[PDB]
Amino acid sequence: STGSATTTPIDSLDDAYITPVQIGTPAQTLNLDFDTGSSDLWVFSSETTASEVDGQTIYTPSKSTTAKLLSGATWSISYGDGSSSSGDVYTDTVSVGGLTVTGQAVESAKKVSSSFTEDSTIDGLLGLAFSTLNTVSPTQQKTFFDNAKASLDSPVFTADLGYHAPGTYNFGFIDTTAYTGSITYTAVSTKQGFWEWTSTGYAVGSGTFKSTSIDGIADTGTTLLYLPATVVSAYWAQVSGAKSSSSVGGYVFPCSATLPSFTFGVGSARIVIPGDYIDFGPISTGSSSCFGGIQSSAGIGINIFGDVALKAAFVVFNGATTPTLGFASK
Numbered sequence: 001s002t003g004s005a006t007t008t009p010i011d012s013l014d015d016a017y018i019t020p021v022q023i024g025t026p027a028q029t030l031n032l033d034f035d036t037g038s039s040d041l042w043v044f045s046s047e048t049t050a051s052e053v054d055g056q057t058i059y060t061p062s063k064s065t066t067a068k069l070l071s072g073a074t075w076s077i078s079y080g081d082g083s084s085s086s087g088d089v090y091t092d093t094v095s096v097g098g099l100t101v102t103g104q105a106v107e108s109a110k111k112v113s114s115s116f117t118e119d120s121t122i123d124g125l126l127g128l129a130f131s132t133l134n135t136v137s138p139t140q141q142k143t144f145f146d147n148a149k150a151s152l153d154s155p156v157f158t159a160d161l162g163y164h165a166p167g168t169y170n171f172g173f174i175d176t177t178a179y180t181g182s183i184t185y186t187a188v189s190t191k192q193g194f195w196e197w198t199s200t201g202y203a204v205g206s207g208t209f210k211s212t213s214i215d216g217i218a219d220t221g222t223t224l225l226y227l228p229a230t231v232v233s234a235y236w237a238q239v240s241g242a243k244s245s246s247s248v249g250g251y252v253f254p255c256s257a258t259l260p261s262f263t264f265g266v267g268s269a270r271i272v273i274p275g276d277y278i279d280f281g282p283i284s285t286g287s288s289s290c291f292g293g294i295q296s297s298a299g300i301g302i303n304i305f306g307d308v309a310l311k312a313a314f315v316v317f318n319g320a321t322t323p324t325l326g327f328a329s330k
């Protein structure tokens with residue numbers, strides 16, 4: 001089997017991408033935020049505290065003839081941005097782009113933190129990291145991809161995120177028309193439960209490539225590119241007037257600037273992020289200070305190849321017995 005679904009930016013900045021997901025029978029379609037940095041499929045639901053729901057579409061298990069309470073199971077997750085959610089668990093039929101999994105754990109939120117409530121465009125998350133990170137207790141549950149894997153033509157999914165445009169998540173096949181040149185594959189460590197890999201270096205604009213190992217994660221649920229402070233300082237030093245602002249929370253730059261590209265290495269291959277992808281617009285409406293799309297990871301504990309980086313590539317998440325990542329230009 002295979003599946004193919006379009007993923008759509010939630011706003012004009014590509015802050016996140018939503019993909020329609022069919023849950024239950026008859027289908028309830030919710031727009032979920034496919035996260036390769038986490039491993040829970042959770043949804044706004046009829047059980048979510050009413051004051052914490054503000055425009056999201058909810059899953060109502062009592063209206064699904066295939067829903068079953070997973071008795072005794074609870075979940076609770078805290079993300080790297082400080083947001084969180086928790087609740088109980090149903091199993092139900094879940095379909096993405098024509099690919100159907102029966103018995104998928106659907107984590108129904110009883111509580112969500114304020115950033116979820118305040119974003120009406122996101123109805124939940126679909127985790128695509130390794131199932132070892134799934135938070136369901138006392139019986140850990142598998143991700144949608146792990147449940148689908150055995151049925152897929154090939155045990156892979158691909159992320160093809162658009163710049164200011166829709167893109168595609170494919171399951172079970174690699175669309176050879178979706179990229180240029182060849183796909184360069186690179187080793188993955190699953191020791192932390194992430195799609196963790198080592199970039200071979202970087203360049204700023206037309207500058208020389210610096211060969212240096214940068215360990216980080218491929219994370220479709222993170223908006224920006226978070227790299228070591230040395231690398232980030234080297235980038236922003238090429239933008240007149242750019243500075244790190246403690247009050248704003250990162251590097252800002254004059255909105256009048258033209259940003260240089262940023263290149264990252266994948267083996268001997270190179271992925272070029274155009275400068276325009278690094279512009280996240282005014283820090284507040286009407287400001288002439290703009291927020292940068294490359295930020296320091298120093299306060300995180302891990303480097304994160306988020307959407308800014310991934311949208312410059314066609315990315316293969318190869319879930320074979322020994323997982324690997326593939327990157328191609330497009």
Ligand SMILES: Cc1ccc(NC(C)(C)C(=O)O)cc1
Nearest residue numbers: 079081083115116119122221
């Ligand atoms: C509405 C919303 C709220 C939070 C996030 N951040 C997530 C994906 C949870 C993270 O892992 O940092 C994304 C969207």
